[PDB]
Amino acid sequence: MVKQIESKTAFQEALDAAGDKLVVVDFSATWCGPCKMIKPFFHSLSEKYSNVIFLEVDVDDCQDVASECEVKCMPTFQFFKKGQKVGEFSGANKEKLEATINELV
Amino acid sequence: MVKQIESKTAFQEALDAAGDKLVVVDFSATWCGPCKMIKPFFHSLSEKYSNVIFLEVDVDDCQDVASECEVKCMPTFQFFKKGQKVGEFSGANKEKLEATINELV
């Protein structure tokens, strides 16, 4: 399932506890249309790939995490492996989302 | 000077009262880095071109205007002429901003 991140401390902790696993972070905003459209698919993905950690960060709630991750478009997906960012793209592209997961897993 | 828009009613009114003039709308967010970097320049522009109306919309404040204008990246500049959108681009590109203003004025 998707983990809801509500603090910078929580973001760091989850990245740390992911250990070996790939972390996919969804940076969204409630006003963004595309973000709402792709949410169900993003959740479906967390149920399909249990060997991958799925994170959700609302930019309004965590402006500090948003800023530090240099997010500028919505939605933005950032991929992390052992605390290091290994991928990133923006736009609600379903195929590309799953496709990128299969490349970095 | 730059007009601060704080409602959907205010957005429509300003578009209406612009009459013949070109309206440049800056869709920004306080957490967005690029948005802060280009704010001074955007204001400088409003003082340089008095025949052009400059609008500022914080996406957090006006989620409804943000949504209806289909904004997805920050900052986003939308250009309006007689109620109709005639241009649009995202990213804090100074040259392109002024350049687009000179094309649509």
Side-chain angles (χ1 to χ4, degrees):
Chain A
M1 243 86 84
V2 185
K3 315 163 107 63
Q4 186 73 47
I5 300 299
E6 294 295 345
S7 88
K8 177 171 178 272
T9 302
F11 191 65
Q12 318 183 99
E13 299 274 13
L15 279 201
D16 181 272
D20 224 24
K21 296 133 146 237
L22 165 74
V23 190
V24 184
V25 187
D26 172 359
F27 284 100
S28 82
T30 67
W31 50 264
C32 212
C35 296
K36 296 192 276 229
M37 229 115 343
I38 210 187
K39 200 165 105 107
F41 181 77
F42 183 76
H43 278 53
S44 99
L45 239 31
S46 61
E47 266 151 15
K48 167 162 181 186
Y49 300 89
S50 40
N51 44 140
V52 175
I53 312 279
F54 295 83
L55 263 33
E56 240 243 82
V57 175
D58 184 310
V59 305
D60 310 303
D61 290 356
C62 299
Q63 311 205 328
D64 43 348
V65 184
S67 299
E68 298 192 7
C69 290
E70 314 221 302
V71 168
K72 53 202 93 257
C73 285
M74 237 102 269
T76 278
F77 300 97
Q78 291 191 345
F79 298 82
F80 292 88
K81 216 145 195 27
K82 286 169 137 136
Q84 197 205 217
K85 182 167 78 226
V86 300
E88 170 182 7
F89 79 85
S90 55
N93 189 332
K94 287 170 150 142
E95 217 194 271
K96 182 183 304 207
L97 213 203
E98 188 154 17
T100 309
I101 279 169
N102 278 295
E103 204 283 323
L104 305 156
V105 75
Chain B
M1 243 86 84
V2 185
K3 315 163 107 63
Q4 186 73 47
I5 300 299
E6 294 295 345
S7 88
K8 177 171 178 272
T9 302
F11 191 65
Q12 318 183 99
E13 299 274 13
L15 279 201
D16 181 272
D20 224 24
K21 296 133 146 237
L22 165 74
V23 190
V24 184
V25 187
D26 172 359
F27 284 100
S28 82
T30 67
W31 50 264
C32 212
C35 296
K36 296 192 276 229
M37 229 115 343
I38 210 187
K39 200 165 105 107
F41 181 77
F42 183 76
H43 278 53
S44 99
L45 239 31
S46 61
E47 266 151 15
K48 167 162 181 186
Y49 300 89
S50 40
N51 44 140
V52 175
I53 312 279
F54 295 83
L55 263 33
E56 240 243 82
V57 175
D58 184 310
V59 305
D60 310 303
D61 290 356
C62 299
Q63 311 205 328
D64 43 348
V65 184
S67 299
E68 298 192 7
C69 290
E70 314 221 302
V71 168
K72 53 202 93 257
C73 285
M74 237 102 269
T76 278
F77 300 97
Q78 291 191 345
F79 298 82
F80 292 88
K81 216 145 195 27
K82 286 169 137 136
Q84 197 205 217
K85 182 167 78 226
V86 300
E88 170 182 7
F89 79 85
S90 55
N93 189 332
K94 287 170 150 142
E95 217 194 271
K96 182 183 304 207
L97 213 203
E98 188 154 17
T100 309
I101 279 169
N102 278 295
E103 204 283 323
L104 305 156
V105 75

